[PDB]
């Protein structure tokens, strides 16, 4: 049951959203201003909850890789990006450390890869769960490789320019359909997982 809600009393806290949020079990977001800015289908990453994530992630942990840790890390990166955006906007852009630049760069690629959509199903509008977890695993491995490379001594522009085709191929993974792989996952993300590890040593030096 997927029932869309809307305001009906002239406020954002009416009894329809109060009874619908209490009677429902999943919380999905929606922004008309974000959808008008070429961000549809947009969703709220700070206000949402689901009870079937553990039960659906239990069979997905055995029959697939650890998508549940990448979902919590992807939610934590989007939660930290909103906190870093206020300090970057208020205090200034060239006043932050190099640690927040990797989280903002991973949050921009995750928001551009997941939040970015075009049309209904045109231009590769289909995405499986294994392709989404494999696409998020390259972003989490690239963010962990950039955060681990920046901790051992490395410039921010040297590592961001040292990424190169990894960020363009990871950001451009929304146009590759499932025909490239077998039925669910794409082999280019599996080769890109080793390509990110091979590019992680070149990105540090």
């Amino acid at each position: 049951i997927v029932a869309a809600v809307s305001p009906a009393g002239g406020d954002f806290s009416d009894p329809v959203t109060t009874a619908t949020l209490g009677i429902t079990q999943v919380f999905w977001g929606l922004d008309k201003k974000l959808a008008q800015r070429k961000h549809f289908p947009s969703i709220n990453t700070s206000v949402s909850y689901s009870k079937y994530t553990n039960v659906l992630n239990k069979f997905y942990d055995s029959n697939y890789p650890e998508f549940p840790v990448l979902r919590d890390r992807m939610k934590e990166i989007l939660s930290n990006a909103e906190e870093l955006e206020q300090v970057v906007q208020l205090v200034g852009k060239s006043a932050l450390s190099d640690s927040d630049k990797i989280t903002l760069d991973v949050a921009t690629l995750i928001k551009e890869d997941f939040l970015q959509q075009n049309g209904y199903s045109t231009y590769d509008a289909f995405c499986p769960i294994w392709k989404t977890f494999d696409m998020m695993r390259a972003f989490i491995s690239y963010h962990d490789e950039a955060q681990k490379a920046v901790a051992n001594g490395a410039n921010w522009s040297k590592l961001a320019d040292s990424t190169g085709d990894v960020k363009h191929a990871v950001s451009s993974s929304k146009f590759f359909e499932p025909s490239r792989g077998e039925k669910e996952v794409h082999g280019e993300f599996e080769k890109l997982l080793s390509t990110m590890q091979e590019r992680f040593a070149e990105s540090t030096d």
């Binding site: 002239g10 406020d11 954002f12 806290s13 206020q86 300090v87 208020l90 205090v91 200034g92 060239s94 006043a95």
Partner: protein
């Protein structure tokens, strides 16, 4: 002008963002306020130390030039075409703002000149220049932080005025508008229930009799 129903939700996030920006501006103003006096003490000692160290080397060079006769200090200034102790600019992030730093460098292109040996007075001229270079290196190394102190002293006055202006102008319009919006929403929510109760009393009064 403003809304009449559900308008406190923007004022709450605006007040929270104004409080977070006032807290960050207070932290940056505290860090710049500590670094300003922290550079001001070392600049205050380095001004008198560079003044005495420059006065001693100026007195020794004045005594050597007065004892020499036919002082070639104008010829030594005209004969110089390159420097020995140089400086390099560098940007250092301290408290969020970019400060100017100086790095001393040794020039091995020119150590001795054509006025360093002429006779008996050349040993006194080289003896004065040997202490003049050692006093000049500590004078530049002590005078390096003046651009950073002058930058932090200019940045702190803008940061304190911005934090005081935003913190002084942030909360009261949104709170005073949100209170009157909540009271107007309470009265508008009460009037429709009062009219429906007034119609419901006369509506139930007919069914209560029969």
């Amino acid at each position: 002008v403003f809304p009449t129903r559900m308008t406190l939700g923007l004022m709450k996030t605006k007040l929270k963002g104004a409080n977070q920006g006032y807290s960050l501006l207070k932290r940056k103003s505290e860090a710049l306020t500590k670094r300003f006096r922290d550079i001001t003490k070392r600049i205050d000692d380095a001004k008198q130390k560079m003044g005495r160290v420059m006065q001693t080397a100026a007195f020794s060079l004045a005594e050597v030039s007065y004892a020499t006769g036919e002082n070639i200090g104008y010829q030594v200034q005209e004969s110089v075409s390159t420097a020995r102790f140089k400086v390099r600019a560098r940007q250092e992030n301290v408290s969020g703002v970019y400060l100017s730093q100086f790095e001393s460098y040794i020039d091995p292109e020119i150590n001795d000149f054509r006025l360093t040996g002429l006779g008996r007075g050349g040993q006194q001229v080289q003896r004065a220049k040997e202490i003049y270079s050692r006093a000049v290196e500590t004078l530049v190394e002590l005078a390096s932080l003046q651009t950073a102190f002058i930058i932090l002293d200019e940045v702190i006055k803008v940061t304190n005025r911005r934090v005081n202006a935003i913190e002084h102008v942030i909360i009261p319009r949104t709170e005073n508008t949100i209170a009157y919006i909540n009271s107007e929403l309470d009265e508008l929510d009460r009037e429709e229930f009062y009219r429906l109760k007034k119609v419901q009393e006369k509506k139930q009064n007919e069914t209560a009799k029969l």
